[PDB]
C-alpha cells in the first residue's frame, strides 16, 4: 500500500503516465489498509434520556439517568 | 420407639425433605407471581443487570 501510494506520488518526477493495472492495484492495497485501520464510533445515550424502574436503581444504580459523557 | 430425642429429630428431618421434594414448583409459581405483581421493580427481574 505505502509503495504504491508513493509509486502514484512520484512518477511525475519522471513524467509517466500510471496505467489502470498500476491504479487498480494501487487501490487495492489501499482499501485492504484502509479496512485493517477502520473503527466505526457508537452513539452513547443522550444524558437526559431515563432509565427505566427495572434496573432497580439507589439499589442497583446510583443514578436514575444516563451520564452519557467521557 | 425412638427413646432418644436424637432419634426422634432425624426422622422429622427426613419427613421435611420429602414433603419439601414434590411441592417445589408450585410454590415457584406463586412466589414468582406474587412478586411479579406487587415489587415495584419486579416486572424485569431476571436480567436486572444487563447490557
Known sequence: ?????????MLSDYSLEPTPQVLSNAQRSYD?????????????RRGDFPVGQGNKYDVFTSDRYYPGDL | MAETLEKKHERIMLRFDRAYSPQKEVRE???????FARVPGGQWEGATAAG
Open chain 1, 1 to 9: 500500500a505505502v509503495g504504491y501510494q508513493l509509486l502514484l506520488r
Open chain 1, 32 to 44: 485492504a489498509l484502509m479496512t485493517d485501520t477502520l473503527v466505526v464510533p457508537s452513539m452513547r
Open chain 2, 29 to 35: 409459581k406463586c412466589i414468582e407471581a406474587t412478586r
